[PDB]
Amino acid sequence: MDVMNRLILAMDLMNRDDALRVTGEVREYIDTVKIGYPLVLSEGMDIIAEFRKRFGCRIIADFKVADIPETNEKICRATFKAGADAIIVHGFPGADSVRACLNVAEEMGREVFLLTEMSHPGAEMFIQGAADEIARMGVDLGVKNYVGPSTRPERLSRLREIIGQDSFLISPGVGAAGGDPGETLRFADAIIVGASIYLADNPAAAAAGIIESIK
Amino acid sequence: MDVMNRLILAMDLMNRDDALRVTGEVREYIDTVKIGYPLVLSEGMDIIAEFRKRFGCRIIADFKVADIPETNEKICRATFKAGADAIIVHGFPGADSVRACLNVAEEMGREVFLLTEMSHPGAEMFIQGAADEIARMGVDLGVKNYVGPSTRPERLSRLREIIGQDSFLISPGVGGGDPGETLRFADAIIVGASIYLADNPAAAAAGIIESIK
Ligand SMILES: O=c1cc(O)n([C@@H]2O[C@H](COP(=O)(O)O)[C@@H](O)[C@H]2O)c(=O)[nH]1
Ligand SMILES: O=c1cc(O)n([C@@H]2O[C@H](COP(=O)(O)O)[C@@H](O)[C@H]2O)c(=O)[nH]1
């Protein structure tokens, strides 16, 4: 995927009018938008096609798919039919669950991103300990796209080592309570930024500032 | 939670007309319906209030919530605002992620179910090893409702030991797990396709209910 400015917008506003306005304002800097359940459950799956048409952006559906294989397939298919370019899926439910999502993505000409490790404090309890193994499972399954935490660069470096240089890696948890934009981009292909942009008084300026900091 | 006949319908059909037809056909047996992303993503979140209105049933939103705290908070608010009586949340992402859902539920007067172990084969890779710790985490958080797999009776028994007798436990994967034995440990069983794909859902439900007593 070709992510403009290596910066992905996490559009987690839950009001259509506000989500549209903010996303529109930063289209000059960002052409790849991560849409998750807060927006989708508030405004409907139609919002994905609307965003694509209105802003001419790529959409990553951040649905953290985490069910049994048959249910996973149903979610993935519905999500791709709704126009998503890619979908983010959890690895902790096991290889069969992940394989199911890969089935559907292959069948429909779309992409799966595998979430191997998370950025919040609770990730220390069970996810961190499984992270290397989940990433290796991804490699064994032929996964090419990954999501991993910027909150700790040493962990992010280890992930990149597991998945190789050819794999695509995107990373959330950027900022004060997270990692540094520049440092993260030593290992990740793109960073994901949400509230710092969408709650900013001037979202366009917030985005420009982040891109400046990583010139 | 009072589940009629200890039997929860997993309404995973993706067509509103068919979902409504089948649910109507078994309402005389089942008053508690699990609605997941397949139906909600196809037909929209409004389907939850429509089910509760049309059937006078309780709805468990099976969204397997598995994000960071701030995102889980948003998902739970939207879900409860849509009328869900309960939401199912993953424990694997850790305590703060679960706490977020619990706090929202408690603020809104709704319920959280903690999913501790899953029923499918891949569950053995990562989740099974963490399942008892996840249940113990839930217990300390004050979780009172749990989900665990009918396909592994020994695991289900241990989960019941951990959560204690006062906690509420529901269990899918029946087919597969046996209804009667599962109910030695679970308060209710969850059943999907063997009811909703049947020639006669009512009889299918009636049969299951019969095999229990
Ligand atoms: O480990 C992870 C995985 C995520 O998807 N995310 C997601 O990335 C986004 C981050 O947004 P924010 O920059 O406002 O923290 C949110 O949509 C969140 O759900 C995350 O923060 N950490
Ligand atoms: O471990 C689990 C957790 C679940 O929620 N489920 C859910 O329970 C339901 C089971 O449906 P079925 O009886 O047709 O197998 C599905 O909605 C599925 O997503 C499961 O099967 N195993």
Distance of CA A172 to the CA centre of its chain: 7
Tokens describing residue A22: 């903010």
CA atoms within 13 A on the CB side of B5: 22
Classified as helix, coil or strand, B35 is strand
Q: What domains are there in chain B, each with its CATH number? A: 1-213 (3.20.20.70)
Ligand 1 touching residue A36 (CB < 6 A):
yes
Contacts of A44 in chain B (CB under 8 A): 44-45
* Chain length of chain B: 213
Resolution in A: 1.9
Chain B residue whose CA is closest to A91: B126
The catalytically annotated residue of B64, B81, B144, B213 is B64
Dihedral sign (CA A73, A75, A80, A85)? negative
User: Is the minimum CB–CB distance between B140 and chain A shorter than 8 Å?
Assistant: no
Please enumerate in sequence order all residues whose Cβ is within 8 A of that of B127, keeping only pairs 6 or more positions apart, or say none: A92, A93, A94, B92, B117, B118
CB B81 within 8 A of CB B46: no
Contacts of B64 in chain A (CB under 8 A): 66-67
The type of residue at B191 is V
d(CA A188, CA A168): 8
Element (H, E) at A115: strand A111-115
Chain B residue whose CA is closest to A62: B67
Query: Which residue in B42, B64, B79 is closest to A78 by CB distance?
Result: B42
Q: Tell me the DSSP string of B1-18.
A: ---GGGEEEEE----HHH
Query: Which residue in B42, B79, B127 is closest to A93 by CB distance?
Result: B127
Q: At what angle do helices B95-108 and B69-81 cross, to 10 degrees?
A: 30
Determination technique for this PDB entry? X-ray
User: Is the minimum CB–CB distance between B55 and chain A shorter than 8 Å?
Assistant: no
Please enumerate in sequence order all residues whose Cβ is within 8 A of that of B73, keeping only pairs 6 or more positions apart, or say none: B100, B101, B103, B104
d(CA A100, CA A94): 10
Ligand 2 touching residue B179 (CB < 6 A):
no
| Of residues A135, A117, A119, A113, the one with CA closest to residue A60 | A113
d(CA B166, CA A155): 41
d(CA B90, CA B114): 6
Q: Under an 8 A CB cutoff, do B94 and A125 touch?
A: yes
